[PDB]
Amino acid sequence: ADRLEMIINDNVSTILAGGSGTGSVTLAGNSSLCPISGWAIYSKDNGIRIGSKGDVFVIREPFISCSHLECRTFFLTQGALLNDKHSNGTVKDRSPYRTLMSCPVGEAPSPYNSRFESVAWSASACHDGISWLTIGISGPDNGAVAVVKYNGIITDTIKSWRNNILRTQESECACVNGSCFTVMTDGPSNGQASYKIFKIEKGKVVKSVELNAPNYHYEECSCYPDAGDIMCVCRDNWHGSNRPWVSFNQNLEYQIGYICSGVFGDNPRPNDGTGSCSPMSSNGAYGVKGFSFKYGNGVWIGRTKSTSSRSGFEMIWDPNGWTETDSSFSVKQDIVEITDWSGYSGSFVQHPEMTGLDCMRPCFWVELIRGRPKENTIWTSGSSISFCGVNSDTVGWSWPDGAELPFTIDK
Amino acid sequence: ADRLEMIINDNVSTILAGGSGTGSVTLAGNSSLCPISGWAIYSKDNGIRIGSKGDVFVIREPFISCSHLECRTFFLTQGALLNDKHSNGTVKDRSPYRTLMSCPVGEAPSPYNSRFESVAWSASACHDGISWLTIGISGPDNGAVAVVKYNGIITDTIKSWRNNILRTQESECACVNGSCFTVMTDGPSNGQASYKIFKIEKGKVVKSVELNAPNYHYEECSCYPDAGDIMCVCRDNWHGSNRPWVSFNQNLEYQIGYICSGVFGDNPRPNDGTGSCSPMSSNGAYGVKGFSFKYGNGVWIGRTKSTSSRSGFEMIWDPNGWTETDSSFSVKQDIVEITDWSGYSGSFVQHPEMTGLDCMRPCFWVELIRGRPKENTIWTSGSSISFCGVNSDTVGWSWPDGAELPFTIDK
Amino acid sequence: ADRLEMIINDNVSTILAGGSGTGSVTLAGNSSLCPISGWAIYSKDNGIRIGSKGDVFVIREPFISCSHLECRTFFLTQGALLNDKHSNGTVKDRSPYRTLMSCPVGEAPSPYNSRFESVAWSASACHDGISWLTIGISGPDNGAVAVVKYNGIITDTIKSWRNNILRTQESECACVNGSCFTVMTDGPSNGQASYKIFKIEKGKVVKSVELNAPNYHYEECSCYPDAGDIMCVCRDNWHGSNRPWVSFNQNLEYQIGYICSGVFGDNPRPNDGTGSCSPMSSNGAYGVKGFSFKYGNGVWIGRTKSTSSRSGFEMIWDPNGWTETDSSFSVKQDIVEITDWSGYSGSFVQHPEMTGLDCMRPCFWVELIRGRPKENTIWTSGSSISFCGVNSDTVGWSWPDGAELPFTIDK
Amino acid sequence: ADRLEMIINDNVSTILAGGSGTGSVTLAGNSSLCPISGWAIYSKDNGIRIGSKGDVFVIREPFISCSHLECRTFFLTQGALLNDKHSNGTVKDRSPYRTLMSCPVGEAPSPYNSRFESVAWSASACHDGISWLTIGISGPDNGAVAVVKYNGIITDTIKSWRNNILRTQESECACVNGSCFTVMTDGPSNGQASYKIFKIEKGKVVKSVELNAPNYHYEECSCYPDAGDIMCVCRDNWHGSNRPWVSFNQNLEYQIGYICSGVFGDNPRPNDGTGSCSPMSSNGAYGVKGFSFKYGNGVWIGRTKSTSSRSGFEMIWDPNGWTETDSSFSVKQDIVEITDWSGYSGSFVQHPEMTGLDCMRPCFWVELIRGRPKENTIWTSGSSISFCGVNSDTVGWSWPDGAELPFTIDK
Ligand SMILES: *[C@@H]1O[C@H](CO)[C@@H](O[C@@H]2O[C@H](CO)[C@@H](O[C@@H]3O[C@H](CO)[C@@H](O)[C@H](O)[C@@H]3O)[C@H](O)[C@H]2NC(C)=O)[C@H](O)[C@H]1NC(C)=O
Ligand SMILES: *[C@@H]1O[C@H](CO)[C@@H](O[C@@H]2O[C@H](CO)[C@@H](O[C@@H]3O[C@H](CO)[C@@H](O)[C@H](O)[C@@H]3O)[C@H](O)[C@H]2NC(C)=O)[C@H](O)[C@H]1NC(C)=O
Ligand SMILES: *[C@@H]1O[C@H](CO)[C@@H](O[C@@H]2O[C@H](CO)[C@@H](O[C@@H]3O[C@H](CO)[C@@H](O)[C@H](O)[C@@H]3O)[C@H](O)[C@H]2NC(C)=O)[C@H](O)[C@H]1NC(C)=O
Ligand SMILES: *[C@@H]1O[C@H](CO)[C@@H](O[C@@H]2O[C@H](CO)[C@@H](O[C@@H]3O[C@H](CO)[C@@H](O)[C@H](O)[C@@H]3O)[C@H](O)[C@H]2NC(C)=O)[C@H](O)[C@H]1NC(C)=O
Ligand SMILES: *[C@@H]1O[C@H](CO)[C@@H](O)[C@H](O)[C@H]1NC(C)=O
Ligand SMILES: *[C@@H]1O[C@H](CO)[C@@H](O)[C@H](O)[C@H]1NC(C)=O
Ligand SMILES: *[C@@H]1O[C@H](CO)[C@@H](O)[C@H](O)[C@H]1NC(C)=O
Ligand SMILES: *[C@@H]1O[C@H](CO)[C@@H](O)[C@H](O)[C@H]1NC(C)=O
Ligand SMILES: *[C@@H]1O[C@H](CO)[C@@H](O)[C@H](O)[C@H]1NC(C)=O
Ligand SMILES: *[C@@H]1O[C@H](CO)[C@@H](O)[C@H](O)[C@H]1NC(C)=O
Ligand SMILES: *[C@@H]1O[C@H](CO)[C@@H](O)[C@H](O)[C@H]1NC(C)=O
Ligand SMILES: *[C@@H]1O[C@H](CO)[C@@H](O)[C@H](O)[C@H]1NC(C)=O
Ligand SMILES: [Ca+2]
Ligand SMILES: [Ca+2]
Ligand SMILES: [Ca+2]
Ligand SMILES: [Ca+2]
Ligand SMILES: [Ca+2]
Ligand SMILES: [Ca+2]
Ligand SMILES: [Ca+2]
Ligand SMILES: [Ca+2]
Secondary structure (H helix, E strand, C coil): CHHHHHHHHHHHHHHHHHCCCCCCCCCCCCCCECCCCEEEEEEECCHHHHHCCCCCEEEEEEEEEECCCCEEEEEEEEEEECCCHHHCCCCCCCCCCCEEEEEECCCCCCCCCCEEEEECCEEEEEECCCCEEEEEEECCCCCCEEEEEECCEEEEEEECCCCCCCECCCCECEEECCEEEEEEEECCCCCCCEEEEEEEECCEEEEEEECCCCCCCCEEEEEEEECCEEEEEEECCCCCCCCEEEEECCCCCEEEEECCCCCCCCCCCCCCCCCCCCCCCCCCCCCCCCCEEEECCEEEEEECCCCCCCEEEEEEEECCCCCCCCCCCCEEEEEEEEEEECCCEEEEEECHHHHCCCCEEEEEEEEEEEECCCCCCCCEEEEEEEEEEECCCCCCCCCCCCCCCCCHHHC | CHHHHHHHHHHHHHHHHHCCCCCCCCCCCCCCECCCCEEEEEEECCHHHHHCCCCCEEEEEEEEEECCCCEEEEEEEEEEECCCHHHCCCCCCCCCCCEEEEEECCCCCCCCCCEEEEECCEEEEEECCCCEEEEEEECCCCCCEEEEEECCEEEEEEECCCCCCCECCCCECEEECCEEEEEEEECCCCCCCEEEEEEEECCEEEEEEECCCCCCCCEEEEEEEECCEEEEEEECCCCCCCCEEEEECCCCCEEEEECCCCCCCCCCCCCCCCCCCCCCCCCCCCCCCCCEEEECCEEEEEECCCCCCCEEEEEEEECCCCCCCCCCCCEEEEEEEEEEECCCEEEEEECHHHHCCCCEEEEEEEEEEEECCCCCCCCEEEEEEEEEEECCCCCCCCCCCCCCCCCHHHC | CHHHHHHHHHHHHHHHHHCCCCCCCCCCCCCCECCCCEEEEEEECCHHHHHCCCCCEEEEEEEEEECCCCEEEEEEEEEEECCCHHHCCCCCCCCCCCEEEEEECCCCCCCCCCEEEEECCEEEEEECCCCEEEEEEECCCCCCEEEEEECCEEEEEEECCCCCCCECCCCECEEECCEEEEEEEECCCCCCCEEEEEEEECCEEEEEEECCCCCCCCEEEEEEEECCEEEEEEECCCCCCCCEEEEECCCCCEEEEECCCCCCCCCCCCCCCCCCCCCCCCCCCCCCCCCEEEECCEEEEEECCCCCCCEEEEEEEECCCCCCCCCCCCEEEEEEEEEEECCCEEEEEECHHHHCCCCEEEEEEEEEEEECCCCCCCCEEEEEEEEEEECCCCCCCCCCCCCCCCCHHHC | CHHHHHHHHHHHHHHHHHCCCCCCCCCCCCCCECCCCEEEEEEECCHHHHHCCCCCEEEEEEEEEECCCCEEEEEEEEEEECCCHHHCCCCCCCCCCCEEEEEECCCCCCCCCCEEEEECCEEEEEECCCCEEEEEEECCCCCCEEEEEECCEEEEEEECCCCCCCECCCCECEEECCEEEEEEEECCCCCCCEEEEEEEECCEEEEEEECCCCCCCCEEEEEEEECCEEEEEEECCCCCCCCEEEEECCCCCEEEEECCCCCCCCCCCCCCCCCCCCCCCCCCCCCCCCCEEEECCEEEEEECCCCCCCEEEEEEEECCCCCCCCCCCCEEEEEEEEEEECCCEEEEEECHHHHCCCCEEEEEEEEEEEECCCCCCCCEEEEEEEEEEECCCCCCCCCCCCCCCCCHHHC
C-alpha cells in the first residue's frame, strides 16, 4: 500500500507538471547519430512572402530546437515588422531592442504566434527533456551579460570576461543526461579571441573551461550530442575558410581541430582543392554560421554554392572529409540554387525520447536572407527551411525564399 | 497490488500522452456507413470574404480530416496572402513555396491560426486514433518525393517510381485498425499512368501494390473506410466522365471499376444519358476531384451542376447507380447554385470513436474557387463548405463563396 | 481492490475528457436565483473601436453563455470584417454567408480568436456541464433547417414546420439536470405564428410541445433556469409593447403570460402608464430582443431608455411588476445614456458548479448597435457589454460603444 | 484502502483543476527577499515599435504579476489601437471604454493575444497560488465601484466611500497564506485624502482598515510580500518628493512612514541632498508611480534620472537609505538613458513556489511612455521593460522604447 501511495503521488506530480508541458525524464543523449543517405525536407515558413502583407517580424538567425513534445523556431528580432518604417536597418545588430523569441516550426514569425524568450542580441536555446534552457546576451559591447533562464525563470548570468562582445551559438545548445552545454566567445572577430565551453544544469552554470586554442577562432558554434559527448562545428571569422570544431565529454575535457576536407565549408572560401587540418588562410577572413555532422572519418557538410557570396546551399557527404584533405566527395544534394540567396545555417537533433528511434536524428536549418546589403531595401530579414536526415529515398531541388523585392516600405 | 500498479502506470501514460492530444486506442474502422436521408451543413469558412481585409492564405484543396478530438481543414498554400502581390499566380501549382497546413474547421486560413504540416505541392492526411499521419509531396517533376510524418516526425519517404509527377489524394487517407491507406499516381495525366495503393503503420510504409488497371486512370482519390475495407472514388483525367473507383481490404487485395450510373459525376461531362461501367470517353478528358459514397448498388454522387465548368454543386442519391447505367435517380439536394463557382470536393468520415454512433458517418467538403482563370484577377483561391449525412430532415439551398471580385490588388 | 480499479478507471476517463474541456457531471439547475441589489459590470469588448483598424468581424447578437470553465460571447457574422467592402449591408440578415461563432468574453470578435460553431442566420447555444450544445438555423425562408450539434458533432436537425422562417432565441438555451431547453418560432412576425418548446439531451431532441397561445407572439426568447424550471421572457413583434413570457418544467408542461408592469419593457413602446397582463397593443408592433428576471411578484426589467428608438439602457427593479399593472418601481440603475445607441439584450446565468455559490447567478448582456439604418454607413455591427447581479454595492453610469463613425470604408 | 481512495480522489481533483491552470496549494509568502547584487533584464515587448504596423493596443500601466505557472503583463487600454483614429487622446484617463487586460510577458499587447480581465480605469491583480484575483475600478468620479473577481467570477464589490475618485495600485497586489492585500485611495490628489488597506480571501473582502495618516498621501502603491508581512512603497502626489510607505501584517496592523534617503525617489523632485522621514515638500506636488525594496535599513530605489520629467531610469542601492537622510549611495545601475522617455514603474515578486528558491525574488517593471503631452502626437501609449534581481554579475545600459514618432495617424 505504501508502494501504491508512492507511485500515485509521483505519477500525479508528473501529470501536473506535464499539464504545463514540463517533462519528467531527462534526455539520455547517449545514442549515436542515425545512419542516413540523404535529407528529407521538414519545414518552410515562407516568412518574408507572408510578411509582405501579414504582420511578420523582421528576424535573423531562425534556429530550431526541439523538446520531447514539439520543435520550435527561435529567432532574434529588432522588435519591428516587415513593411514598417521601424524595419529600417540603421540599427546595428547589437541593439537594446533585439529579443530572442520562438514560434512553431513552419509558421511565419508573428507577434500573434511568437512567445517571448529573452532580451538578446546573441542567443542560444535547448531542452533537457524537462524544461527549456534559454541564453540571451544583451548589454554594451564592453560588458555584455548573458541571462540564463530555465523554464522561463532567470537562473544564472554570465558576464563578459574580455569586455569585447560576449557572443554565443545562434543555434541550439546540446543536452546530455540532464546537463546542457554551450560555447561562448569573447574578444576580436578579426584576430585571436577567447573561447569557453559551459556545462549548465537546471539553468545553473556548474562548470566552464577556456579552450587553449592558439591560432584557432571559434564563433557561432553548431553543437550536437553524439554517444554522450558533444561535437561543435563552428565559424573561423579570423583566417579560416574551413570550419573549426571542438568536441568534449560531460566533464568538459575537450579536443579541437579543423575539418580537413578540401571541400571547404565556410563562405567566403577558395575553390575546392587541397584542404588542411589547420586554418585555411586563403579567403579565410569573415565567414558564415554553418554546421557539419561527423560520421567516423566522413563528414556531412552543409555549405553555400558560391565561394564569394551567401548564395545557394548544398549538402555534401565526404566519406573521408573529417581527416583527409582531398577535395573529392561521394554525394551532393542540392538544397538552394546558386541563383538564390541563402545565409546562416545550423544543426539540430531529434532525440530518441521524441522520435522513438534507437539513434540520434540529425537535422539542419538554413536561413534565406533578403534585403540589405545586396538588395535595394531599407531592411534585412530571413526566412527558414529545414531538413532531417533519413535512410530512405531523397531528392535535390531548390527551395528559395521567394519574395519579390523591394517592398512597399522601400519606395 | 501488481494489477493496480500496472493499471496506474498504463493509465498515467495514457493521461500524459492525452495531454498533447495523442490518443491511446486505434480507430477500429469496422463499422458500416450510417443510413442517411440527406446532408446537414457542417461548416463554412467565408475565407475569401474575410481575406479581402484579414490576413488569409491564398489556398487550394481545403480538405477536412478528423481525429477523435477535432476536425481540421488541411490545405495547400503558396505562402502568400490574399490582396498581396505575392498572390500573383504566375507560380505554377508545383512550386518550392507550396506547403500543407491546417486550421480548425470553419475558420479562415490565416498565418495566425494555421499549423504547419509539411512542404508539399501534393498532399494527404488522416488520423489513426493515436496521432496524425501527413503525406507531403514536393520536389522536381522527374523525381518528386513524398515525406511521410507521424505525429510531426518524419517516418518515411516515397520517391517517384515513374519520374512523371508523383501525386496523391488531396483529401484524407483512410485508417482501419491502426493501418492507414492511400493512393498515389505517377505518370501522364492525359494517358495511361501507374497507380499504387499504400498501407502505412505509424508513418512507415508496410506494404504497397501497383494496380493492374489497363485503360483506367486514377487521380486525386477520395478514400473512406467501410466495414474494415477501403473504398476510393477518384478522377479519370484521361478519358472518363464517370468516376473511377478502387476498393481494397487491409492486405491491399483490390477491386477496380467505374461508377456505372448515367448520372455522370465528373466535370467536364456529357449530358445525362446511358452510363457505362467502363471509361466514358465523351467529354472525358480533364476532370475535377470528386467523391461518391456506395450503399449496396446505390450511390450518393456529389457533382457540379454544369457539364462544362466548375459551377454549382449538388448531391444525388441514385439507388442503383453503382451498378446500373440508367440516368434516373431518386433524390437531389442542391448545395451550390449553378450561377456560382464550385470546384474540388472530397469525402471525409467521422468514426464511432468520435461520434458515439454505431456506424461510420459520411461527410463531404466542397471547394469554392474564385479568381483565375475565369475571373479577371491575378490570383486564384478557394473557400470551403462542408456537410455531414444525417438520417433526419434536411433542405437544399445555395451556400456560395460570396466574395466581390476583383480585389484591390487586382487594380 | 475491485473498488480501487473501478475508481481509477472512472477518474482516469474523467481526466482524459477534462483534457479537452469536457465535464463529467451535469449542471443540476435546481437552485433559485441569487438575491441581488444591483448589477456589477462584467465585460466590455470595445469591438467596433478596435475594428476601426484591427481585423474584427461585423457581428450581430453577441450573446454570452457559460460552461463550468469559461464564459464565451457567441455571435452571428456575415463573414465580413469592419472597414472592408464586404461589410456592405445589402445582404439581408438571412444569408448563406452567416455563421454562428464564439470568442472569449471581453475580446473583440476576430477571425484570429473566434471558434466556428455552425452555419446560421438564427442561433442558440448553451452548456449542460459536459459539452456545448449549439443550434444553428440556415436555409431558405420556406424550409429553414436548424442543425443541432453536441460537442461539435451534428446530433439532430429540426426543419421548419410552417415554412415561414424558422427562428430561435439569439441567446443561451437553458440546461437543467442534463436536459437543455429552447424555444423556436415559425410563421409571421406581424401576426399569429406557431411557437414550440424543445427538450434536448446530448444534442438529441427528446421532446417538443407546441404552445396553445392564442393572441400571443413569441420571438427571440431569453430563457434561464430557476429551481428546476425554465423561464423565458421574449419579444412580441406583433402587437405587444410589454414582454411575453413562457415558463415550463422538465416535462414541457408550461404556463404563459405577459409582464403586467406599466414599466413597459419592449421597444418601441408607449410612455409608462397602466400596464396589462395581456398584449399591450399601443406601439406594440415591432420590438427588440430583451430579457427580465422574475423574483416572486417582482421583476428586474432591462430596457432601452427611449420609447421609440434603440437608445440607452437601464435596469429597473419593480417589486410587484410581474403581476401588477402600476408604473411605479423601486430602483433604477443606468447602464447606457439615452444619447447613445443600444440594441438587443439578453440574459445568461452562472451556475453553482461554476461560481461556488448556493444559488443561480443572473447576468445580462447588451448589444450596442452602430451603423445602418440610423447612421450614414454601409455596414451595421454591434459591440457588447455585460453585467452580473450582486448583493453588494453597485452604481449606474453609461458604458456606450464609443466608435467614431463613419469609417474609412464609408467614404 | 480507504487512504488510497482518499488520495486518489483528492489528487484527481487537483489534476482536473490543474487542467485549467488552477493551483491546489496557496503561496506561503513567509520567505524573505533574496540577497541580490544587481538586476538582470527579464523582458522587453517593443510594443509601440511593433504597433506602428501591427494591431497593438494603446495602453498604460503595463504591470506584471506572476502565478505558479506564468508571468503576465496586465495593462489598461482605452479599447483603441496604435495608428488608429480612436487612439486620439481627448478621452480622459477615466472613461467607460477603459479595460484591464493581460498578455504574456514580453509580447506586444494585441487583441489577438490579450485576455480580458475587467472593465477598469484603475486596477490591481495578483495570484494566491490557486486562482487570479483581479480588481477593476470603473464608474463615475463621485461613486466609482471596484469589481473584485476571483478566477474570472465576480466575488465582491467595493464602492467609493469619499465620492472622490476611488483608485488603487496599478500594479500587483500581495498574497500571503491564501489572503491577498491591496491599498485603495479615495479623495483629493492635491491634498489630504483617505487611504484604506484591504484583506481579500477567494475574492471576498474579509477585512479593511483605514490608515490614520495625517499629512501623508498614498497613491498607486507598489506592494510586495516579505516574511509574512506586506510592504507598500507608494506615491505622494500632494507634497512629497520622497516616497511614502505602509507596511502591515496579515491582521492589517500597520506602520507608516516616508523613505528617509536624500536620494529622492519621486518625479518631479529636488536635486539630491538632505532627506526627510517626513514628506519632502520641495517639488513634492505631483509624482509618478514607483517602487522600492527594503533590506534592513537599506533600500533599492528605482527612479527616473531627470528631476523634472519622466526621463531615464536607474536602480540605486542605498545601504542606509530607509532610515538615514544622507544622499550617499553604494551602487547605481543604469536602466534607461536620461535622453529617453520612461514613466510608471512597479515591483513584482516571484515566489518560491514558482522559482524553487528558498527566498522571495524581487523584480520590477518600467513603463516607457511615448506620445502626448511631450511629443506631437494625438495619442499616448507605453511599452514595457522588466528586470529581476540576481546575486550574480549584472550590467547597466539603456533599453529605451525605440519608436520613431510621430506615426502615420498623426499626419
Ligand atoms: C533609414 O535610416 C537612416 C539613418 O537614420 C535615414 O537617413 C537619415 O535621414 C535623416 C532624415 O532624413 C537625416 O537627418 C538629416 O540630417 C541633417 C544634419 O545636418 C539635417 O540637415 C536634416 O534636417 C536631417 O535631420 C540623416 O542624416 C540620415 N542619415 C544618414 C546616415 O544619411 C534614412 O532616411 C532612413 N531611410 C528610410 C526611412 O527610408
Ligand atoms: C504577375 O506576374 C507576371 C509574370 O511575372 C507579370 O508579367 C510580367 O511583368 C514583368 C514586369 O512588368 C515583365 O518583365 C518585362 O520583360 C521585358 C523583357 O523584354 C522587359 O522589357 C521589361 O523590363 C520587363 O522586365 C514580364 O515579361 C511579364 N511576364 C509576362 C509573362 O508577360 C505580371 O505583371 C504580374 N502581374 C501583376 C503584378 O499584377
Ligand atoms: C453597397 O451595395 C449596394 C447594392 O449592391 C450598391 O449599390 C449598387 O451599386 C451597383 C454598382 O454601382 C449598381 O449597379 C448598377 O446598375 C445599373 C443597372 O441598370 C447599371 O447601369 C450599372 O452598370 C451598375 O451595375 C446597383 O444598381 C446598386 N444597387 C442599388 C440597390 O442601388 C452600393 O453601391 C454599395 N455601396 C458601397 C460599395 O459603398
Ligand atoms: C482629436 O480630438 C479632438 C477633440 O475632439 C479634435 O478636435 C475637435 O475637432 C472637432 C472637429 O474638427 C471640432 O469640432 C468643431 O467644432 C465647432 C463648434 O463651433 C464647429 O465649427 C465645427 O463644425 C466642428 O464640429 C472640435 O471643436 C475640436 N475640439 C477641440 C477641443 O478643439 C481633434 O481634431 C482630434 N484630432 C485628430 C482626429 O487628429
Ligand atoms: C510513477 O512513479 C513511479 C515511482 O516514482 C516511477 O517509477 C514510475 O516510472 C512513474 N510512472 C510514470 C508513468 O511516470
Ligand atoms: C543510454 O542510457 C539509457 C538510460 O536509460 C540506457 O537504458 C541505454 O541502454 C543507454 N544506451 C546506450 C549506452 O547505448
Ligand atoms: C488503464 O490501464 C489498463 C491496463 O493497461 C487498461 O486495460 C485500461 O483500459 C486503462 N484504462 C483507461 C481508462 O485508459
Ligand atoms: C469492431 O471492432 C471492435 C473492436 O473493439 C469490436 O468490439 C466490435 O464488435 C466490432 N464491430 C463489428 C465487427 O461490427
Ligand atoms: C472517481 O470515480 C468514482 C467511481 O466512478 C466516482 O464516484 C468519483 O466521484 C470519481 N471522482 C472524481 C474526483 O471524479
Ligand atoms: C439540487 O440537486 C443536487 C444534486 O446533487 C442536490 O445535492 C441538492 O440538494 C439539490 N438542491 C436543492 C433541491 O435545493
Ligand atoms: C494527494 O492527496 C493527498 C490527500 O489529500 C494529499 O496529501 C497529497 O499532497 C496529494 N498529492 C498531490 C501530488 O497533489
Ligand atoms: C513557510 O511556511 C511553510 C509552509 O509549508 C513552511 O514549511 C516553512 O518552513 C515556512 N518558512 C519559514 C517560516 O521560514
Ligand atoms: Ca572564415
Ligand atoms: Ca574526400
Ligand atoms: Ca474526366
Ligand atoms: Ca439510376
Ligand atoms: Ca413589440
Ligand atoms: Ca410596480
Ligand atoms: Ca510627489
Ligand atoms: Ca545613504
